[PDB]
């Protein structure tokens, strides 16, 4: 039914997204990109691990779904269903075609066969945020997910706080100075701009960090 992934591993064509020109495209195999305690606060999961691609290639939606399922299952089995948050950081937007074998190569432009994601070198594939006590479990879950993807991947322990853009020390210092507003999983840094009356007492600052 489906060709082996080796037929579409390498990025050879220009992006071919679903649009008004490309119609009749099947839906991706992966539809959920966040699993675990996605509603947990930013301040509860400081530890972050990334499964990062090291190859320029195409990753299929089926492979993404399988990797997500495996990682989520192992994380739930090991650390529990409320001890982690897993985010798939790649969306398959490239449509892969197929020339179903009228005769020969005449009119060979293929019809949409599937969807996949174009991944660059060093691109994050999977992210897991949890407490310091589940770091090894997260690393092993990512290592298990590794076998579901083609090419080469690497597990990298992020220096950032959870899924935020601040390092752990910087985030701690900003919170100590009261410059951090929790926004779901994200964190908002307070500057020295905007309407002064819009700042609550103690949240107004003369100069930025």
């Amino acid at each position: 039914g489906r060709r082996p992934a080796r037929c579409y591993r390498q990025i050879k064509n220009k992006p071919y997204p679903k649009s008004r020109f490309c119609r009749g495209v099947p839906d991706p195999k992966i539809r959920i990109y966040d699993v675990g305690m996605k509603k947990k606060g930013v301040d509860e999961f400081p530890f972050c691990v990334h499964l990062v691609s090291w190859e320029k290639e195409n990753v299929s939606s089926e492979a993404l779904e399988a990797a997500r399922i495996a990682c989520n299952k192992y994380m739930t089995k090991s650390a529990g269903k409320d001890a982690f948050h897993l985010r798939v950081r790649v969306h398959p937007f490239h449509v892969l075609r197929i020339n179903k074998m009228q005769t020969g190569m005449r009119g060979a432009f293929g019809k949409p066969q599937g969807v996949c994601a174009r991944v660059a070198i060093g691109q994050v594939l999977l992210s897991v945020r949890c407490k310091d006590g589940n770091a090894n479990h997260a690393q092993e879950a990512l290592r298990r997910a590794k076998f579901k993807f083609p090419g080469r991947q690497k597990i990298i322990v992020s220096r950032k706080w959870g899924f935020t853009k601040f390092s752990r020390t910087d985030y701690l210092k900003y919170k100590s100075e009261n410059r951090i507003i929790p926004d779901g999983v994200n964190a908002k840094l307070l500057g020295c701009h905007g309407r002064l009356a819009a700042r609550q007492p103690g949240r107004a600052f003369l100069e930025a960090v």
Binding site: V124, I156, R159, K165
Partner: protein, 163 residues
């Protein structure tokens, strides 16, 4: 014709600049064009009359005629093994006075002045300008030196802003 329309492949070439559409400033119509002036051809996408063919867009030429609303421009065009001096007529909205010879007259005037002074003092000089040549030796005052060394590698810094 023959598979390509007059304005084929002009989506970007003939479009107007971002946030620069609408009415045309009066400076465009307050310009003076004379025979022999060098002009740059820049198509205004809002003026559909007297529009030059897309080839002449972005090219400089010389004025050979002046009509009520347009000017004649002579533009070089390469066709196989020769250059053709093609003469076209273009509305002034699509043309702009060129700066390709702004300094020529100034340089000639200065060269004439220098030659006159040299003749007055009884000397022979060359007014030709020269390309930038090697500089002579000089002394640099010793100051504090900062040592640069190769940076130890850290995989965590391979991503912009860190992983």
């Amino acid at each position: 014709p023959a598979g390509h329309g007059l304005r084929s492949r002009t989506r970007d070439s003939f479009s107007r600049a971002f946030r620069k559409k609408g009415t045309i400033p009066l400076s465009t119509y307050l310009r003076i064009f004379k025979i022999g002036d060098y002009v740059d051809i820049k198509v205004n996408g809002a003026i559909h009359k007297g529009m030059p063919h897309k080839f002449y867009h972005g090219r400089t030429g010389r004025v050979w005629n002046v009509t009520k609303r347009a000017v004649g421009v002579e533009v070089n065009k390469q066709v196989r093994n020769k250059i053709l001096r093609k003469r076209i007529h273009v509305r002034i909205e699509h043309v702009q006075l060129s700066r390709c010879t702004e300094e020529v007259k100034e340089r000639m005037k200065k060269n004439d002045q220098l030659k006159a002074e040299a003749k007055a003092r009884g000397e022979v000089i060359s007014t030709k300008r020269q390309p930038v040549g090697p500089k002579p030796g000089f002394m640099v005052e010793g100051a504090t030196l900062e040592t640069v060394t190769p940076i130890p590698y850290d995989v965590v810094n391979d991503l912009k802003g860190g992983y």
